[PDB]
Symmetry: D4
């Protein structure tokens, strides 16, 4: 479709990615990065379109995508980047930075709710309804459905708008500096997950 570009292995070029921030999500075979391989990277330059990239089993390189991940002048926007950063670093050897996490930003601004999922915050903050996938998907399937492409694109099509609103909220309630420190630490939080502390709050007393 005009909204969703599908690719195998990597972006074909970075012509669409002369931007200051990109929105990223991933699909995997599950929540254990050492067991469950990366299957899809979905990314948007913020212009209302998305690229959905199918990652092959055993794929070690994605040079164009990795250029964006390494580029320190490009902010990588995630919703709950803690997981995606670990998966991406594990897959391609580069820990993306710098980052903005809309879920951390939601936790620091939407102090009246415990519901910080992407669907909930898109409805509340953007008046955008994204459909939640009900049946679980084998994202390692050789052929991905158009339904799967649409779900994957919906994860990134709105993160730039979400970041814009959450930055306003962070400034309004006075927590911009703390959010930024969380974003600076988040790559280390993901590293510690890969290293063996996925189940531990390193800052907890016990």
């Amino acid at each position: 479709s005009m909204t969703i570009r599908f690719h195998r292995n990597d972006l074909p070029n970075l012509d669409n990615y002369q931007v200051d921030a990109v929105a990223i999500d991933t699909e995997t075979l599950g929540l254990n990065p050492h067991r469950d391989r990366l299957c899809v990277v979905q990314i948007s330059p913020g212009d209302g379109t998305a690229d959905v990239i199918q990652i092959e089993a055993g794929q070690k390189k994605a040079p164009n995508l990795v250029k964006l991940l390494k580029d320190r002048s490009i902010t990588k926007i995630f919703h709950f980047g803690r997981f995606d950063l670990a998966v991406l670093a594990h897959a391609f050897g580069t820990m993306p930075q710098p980052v903005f996490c809309t879920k951390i930003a939601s936790k620091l601004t939407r102090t009246y709710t415990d519901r910080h999922g992407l669907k909930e915050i898109c409805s509340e903050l953007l008046d955008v309804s994204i459909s939640k996938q009900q049946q679980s998907s084998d994202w390692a399937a050789e052929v991905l459905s158009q339904a799967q492409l649409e779900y994957a694109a919906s994860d990134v099509l709105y993160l730039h708008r979400l970041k814009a609103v959450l930055e306003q909220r962070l400034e309004r309630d006075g927590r911009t500096k703390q959010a930024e420190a969380c974003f600076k630490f988040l790559p280390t939080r993901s590293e510690l997950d890969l290293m063996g502390w996925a189940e531990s709050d390193i800052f907890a007393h016990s």
Copy 2:
């Protein structure tokens, strides 16, 4: 005693504190910084002596101590600095930095135990036995006992040795960079505690 110097309100001067790192702990009326005032600051320059400073109710200033807290060329060593940093920032208005936390360092090196208390790690890493206070203390008492001064000093007399050993262990098992990122974030972790997130892991999914 020759090991422990007692002071009211503040250090009398910084003649003893021409150092690159200081060891710090505090005593309070309890674990809620908004309710439970700061009562004692104990600090050591690492030379085998300690200063124990009695903090008065309503005391808003401690200029000599605060000079050390603000001095970015002086590393402040804590065991579980997350709490002390919040108490100190709440009391005097300065968030101390930069910091080294021996409890975070223990969690990242002593991967074979869940026991990361100061007494346990001093015994294991330093062959130093520190006596644990058994009965709970009113640290807001007008007169502090010599026993209380000794307990307070024991909290800081060994942190320089502990940091030396833990830095070696961090380098041996390859986690120096992650530890340093945790130390950079820790002042924000303490800020978030004071701001209302004391009971939340900001990096958790839910």
Copy 3:
């Protein structure tokens, strides 16, 4: 509308409030009064209308509303006043009294259920259906919607009727005196919450 009067900062006058009891609720940025500011005070004199007052960030005074809060000849009716009393005292410096809490009264009369929410008790006791707000609201928004005004007004439009029925039930089952003692203590319960005991039943054994 004729049912709902909107105001900024404060009631314009007390012409509508020559009454023996007022019904009050609040909206905030969340459940932590030290973190989450007061955003809305909604109040009804019991005549089938409601005033919805938008409270600005940093607002320290609301003189007309505070006159009602201080007036010991005016009973302040809440549903779960424990929270609202703490928020109001924190915002404006006056602990409202005397009070009647329809949730405490429900607990002492509706001994056949664990459901003591306002919607449930309005349906059962008054045959009045109030719509529950489904999506969470940013009550600190510069502009409040008419939907938000209606939700806020629904919190206070029926508390006088509810108190009338609950007083009858308290007398029928013989617990008026105990309810009144609870209402006398409730301002202290809210004070203790602000002081640091929000998570503790002060009367519990342990």
Copy 4:
């Protein structure tokens, strides 16, 4: 002994009780006042002696003791009066008042510990060691041992000293007014226990 006077049913007179406050504890057959009868009332006028009164099965009256319970000019001191007030009111028909509870006072002053038992607070606040009874006692036995009399007396011999110290601590940390409101409510808390709410915090949200 000179410290402990034993009585059957009631105090023989109130010659020893021309005082402004009395210290009281009880022994029962267990923690359920409707099932487990009152067996012993122990009381001290604060002069370093104690009266231990054996209560018979089915005993409905204790006129001299009840005169003290009703006397509003005499403060009844308990450690955790919530239970004793319910037992006494159930046994003799009078809810004692006014009261001072050293356990509530401890909770409001000893903010650095979760240990608020009588033995712990006597050691810490009074430097008085009271022996804890290790084996459980049948307090309904026809004959009480001297050991049992000593345990019962130890419960009341020090409450006046404890109240003196805790009043100083309440004033030092600024919570005298809140403590007094708790003491005023406590008789109602005990009434609500007898009425069927022993397992419910009436002030809880849910």
Copy 5:
């Protein structure tokens, strides 16, 4: 209606009750028999009709109903008689016996489910759909609704049919003798509840 006869205080006579078994349920102000008075007794002779008896506050006698409760030649059928037996014994001073409990019988026969409620077992065993009351009822109300009468009657209109089917199932799977021993003990189980063991399995190890 022809199915439901309403009475105040007691059955007018026992002309309808020349039977070998009666079906009984009750309504109360809640689940604590010492606090929550008996409000309704509903009873059926098994002929497809039901008597619904409104019990007044403070009512100590119901002579015709109590004749049935005491009559050892008449089996009293309950669904979960453990509660009703305690309420009835508390209200009128007679522990009904002998009894049959369809819930105990269900537990001993319907070994393939954890759902032993009356609605579930009537649907499964009788192909009879009884409507569950959704909103909670004040059964102490001076005036009971026809809806309330129908709910109360539905509790007893089918227990004879249920007992017939459950007796067949008990015989089929070989547990008639154990069921009968449970029914013989059940009045004592209800007595122990009234005596103070409502929260304890007396046969448990600990």
Copy 6:
């Protein structure tokens, strides 16, 4: 129907069972094999038809079915065979082997979900919707309904297709060898359940 053949006690012959694998499920009176007898065995040769065999109370033999269970050249396919293997071994004295368990295979392949029920995996892997039985069934009833026969047949009509897809997934993600070792152990796991370890993970540390 042409899809479902009903039998009493046993298959009439094995003309339909000249196959390399059979799909099997059972129905019982509940989840405790020592208490809850086998009531139904449902089996399919994989050709789109199913045999539903009613097992009588006290039935000790089913010679034709047991020939299939013992035949080591015939793989017995189950969904969660752990339970069925114990029930079958308990009923007829033969532990079926070798086996394939689609639930173990699902756990080893569908690493992105915790939902491993037959309905869920048939929908996801086969695009086959099987209706879940909502009301609980007495499977020991003398007469089984056509609805019950259809539910029982649905348990086995698709297991050959499910095994085909799961074998492909096991090979794709590299866990065929581990799955096969689990299938070899499963008969012992069921034996240990019958022997008294039904509630213990024998491989757990503690």
Copy 7:
């Protein structure tokens, strides 16, 4: 010794057992009667001596002991008979009756404690100290130690004294009738354990 007579398989005669009550305990290979065989029966006629009977693997008969178990004129005293009754009935085919259980009697009299073990109640009620076995024993060993014989005898040497005291306590606090009903039901409680309800309180609501 003169206190302990050892036997293989059975009592040699009943010359010592012309009594109205016997005290009984057992030893097994564990707490699951279907898995863990009976190994020892220890029994006392109440005269200060005990018989310890070693039960062989596969032993189906113990005629002299079983005569006592069946004899309805002989009360069988246990501490927690619920388990021993199931083990004995499983081993020899006779459910012993009538019974007295000192643990049920303790629960109904010692309302001031949750500690109802034999050692605790012997110390408190009899002033008799019995040594608890610290290391776990293989009671199926071909040769039992004298230490094991002494432990086994200590289980029964004092139950007659314990029953005497507990009967007095039951009469004093008015619960003799309820205790007797519990003793009448206990054989059924043990039957239900053997039948498959060992983990269920049959009288519970859910």
Copy 8:
């Protein structure tokens, strides 16, 4: 000492290992094999001596030890081999087999206890007291203490005796075949741990 031979990296030869079974344990930096490297392998040929082998950081080969691990004619005895098998396979690339696990064997024989630790079973089954290490050890230390060597040797010096006794117990209580099936599966259980199922019972329903 004559009992303990220390080696760096590997056994110097297999002259001592012309045996049918070897006893093995390991020491690591913690319980996560992907994070916590192998530090020590301790092994005994069953002759009352032990070899303690220090494993270097990054060591990928131990050819003589690995010859024993691969040798299918040599049974590898562990206490809780589930962990050691994963650590050894992760370190050197060979999954040891066949195996005997004394902890699984204990679980299948010592049905009267939940205590299956090596110290407990050595005391009970062998009358051998092994000292438990109290303080936690850094097993990655460049220099291991003689105390550490003795602890490590104590883990393997008695496993042959333990296996001898447990085989007798397995035969006595009839579970040899089930134990052997568990031992055959255990290498797969350890593989599944390394693959990502360390926290899941693969045989559980859910």
